[PDB]
């Protein structure tokens, strides 16, 4: 005499709990994870150009510590610095080290052009057993340790114009002897001085004689400085002692390069997003792997999971 017709919706035996405006946990039939929380642990070598520093920091590769000269003229999208890196040349420091590391990293290249600096009246290419190159004493590949010739060290006064259409980065240094015997024996003057300038900027550094802690047999130090010369400007270097001279300049580029500290292995595989823990997929909008990232990456959030409902309320009973 009749019929019944019922309307209804599906359910599953075990759905997924999600959060809403009004509920901290409510069950829906299905959801999807919005927070990337895992990595393979390996940094993929495509599509970004990865340069593994191995035993070298970027600054040691820049200066040309002999065991880092393998990196001469190299380029990268991402330079990867390892915790095992070590220095093995003349002990040095870099005032504002972090800034020099950052600007070279961002430039993305160690392309170096040697220039024909003339150093009249001094001895060039000094070296040390703290910085062996082969079996013999040596020095940073990109720096030129000048000392006296005969019994004098004259006032050096040299210029190098920038007649190119890009900015030149010059890396230079100042030697701090540990004793007066050492100062006068190397540079004749009892006190030295190094002045490096352009039309728009200048730096004068006075060396400081004294003992620092023994490093690789030496209580003496070199301080590293840098100078950028724009197209049409000119570099002048003036010194009556203690100059660690540049041999040329690094070409400065702009682009997408950077640097990351990581001990993750590099693998042949493809991933847009790199973290120090390894590459991570970027299909999700958020991630909780690491606040440090490079490339097209989900945004870092504190939550280790956030579920987006993709089905209705689950009401199996």
């Amino acid at each position: 005499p009749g019929a019944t017709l019922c309307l209804g919706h599906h359910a599953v035996p075990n759905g997924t709990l999600v959060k809403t405006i009004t509920d901290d946990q409510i069950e829906v039939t299905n959801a999807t994870e919005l927070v990337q929380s895992s990595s393979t642990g390996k940094i993929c070598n495509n599509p970004h150009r990865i340069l593994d520093g191995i035993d070298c920091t970027l600054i040691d590769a820049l200066l040309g510590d002999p065991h880092c000269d393998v990196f001469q003229n190299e380029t990268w999208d991402l330079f990867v610095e390892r915790s095992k890196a070590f220095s093995n040349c003349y002990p040095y420091d870099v005032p504002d080290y972090a800034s020099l590391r950052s600007l070279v990293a961002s430039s993305g290249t160690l392309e170096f052009i040697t220039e024909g600096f003339t150093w009249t009246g001094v001895t060039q290419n000094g070296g040390s057993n703290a910085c062996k190159r082969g079996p013999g004493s040596g020095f940073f590949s990109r720096l030129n340790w000048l000392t006296k010739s005969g019994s004098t060290y004259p006032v050096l006064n040299v210029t190098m114009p920038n007649n190119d259409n890009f900015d030149k980065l010059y890396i230079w240094g100042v030697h701090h002897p540990s004793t007066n015997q050492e100062q006068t024996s190397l540079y004749v003057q009892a006190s030295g001085r190094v002045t490096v300038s352009t039309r728009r900027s200048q730096q004068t550094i006075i060396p400081n004689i004294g003992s620092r802690p023994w490093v690789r047999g030496l209580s003496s130090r070199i301080s590293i400085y840098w100078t950028i010369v724009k197209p049409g400007d000119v570099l002048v270097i003036n010194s009556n002692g203690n100059l660690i001279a540049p041999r040329g300049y690094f070409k400065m580029r702009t682009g997408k390069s950077s640097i990351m500290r990581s001990d993750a292995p590099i693998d042949t595989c493809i991933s847009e997003c790199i973290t120090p823990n390894g590459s991570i997929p970027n299909d999700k909008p958020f991630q909780n792997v690491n606040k440090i990232t490079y490339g097209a990456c989900p945004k870092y959030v504190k939550q280790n999971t956030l579920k987006l409902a993709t089905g209705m309320r689950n009401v199996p009973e």
Partner: protein, 171 residues
């Protein structure tokens, strides 16, 4: 949900309705049957896929940034670097928490809404030939074999064919 159908006047879900999200079950003289409703199912699925695709679209691409871990104590500048990053992370974390709360509230309401719309549409087809029993079911007051049921499911049911029979039975 806002509409009161799912987890409401529909007492529970159907684990046996595997080929759709919403649908019809019937009992008539020929036995019982079930069929998914494609249009309502597809409307929910399309909205949810729309939502999902807006959300997982295009991560940002960032290259050289600031340092975020430090091996030496430095004071003022490092305090500021860490504060800027912590501030950023807390704001994005808030954005992510709020986004899923709002989305999920809305997904539960839109799915409830689609159930309710299918219910309303079915009732409107049946006109004076059926009564709403209150539990998502219609009592149909005329003989309604399988072809007749299918005519309701496929939107071609002609209420006038059955109205005299149905009214006699109801009143």
């Amino acid at each position: 949900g806002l509409f009161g159908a799912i987890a409401g006047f529909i007492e529970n879900g159907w684990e046996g309705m595997i080929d759709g999200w919403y649908g019809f079950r019937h009992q008539n003289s020929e036995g019982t049957g079930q069929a998914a409703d494609l249009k309502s199912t597809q409307a929910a699925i399309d909205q949810i896929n729309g939502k999902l695709n807006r959300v997982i679209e295009k991560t940002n691409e960032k290259f050289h940034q600031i340092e975020k871990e430090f091996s030496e104590v430095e004071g003022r500048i490092q305090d500021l670097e860490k504060y800027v990053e912590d501030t950023k992370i807390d704001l994005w974390s808030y954005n992510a928490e709020l986004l899923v709360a709002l989305e999920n509230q809305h997904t539960i309401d839109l799915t409830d809404s689609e159930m309710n719309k299918l219910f309303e549409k079915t009732g409107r087809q049946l006109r004076e030939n059926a009564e709403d029993m209150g539990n998502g079911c219609f009592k149909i007051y005329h003989k309604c074999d399988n072809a007749c049921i299918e005519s309701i499911r496929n939107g071609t049911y002609d209420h006038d064919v059955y109205r005299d029979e149905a009214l006699n039975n109801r009143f």
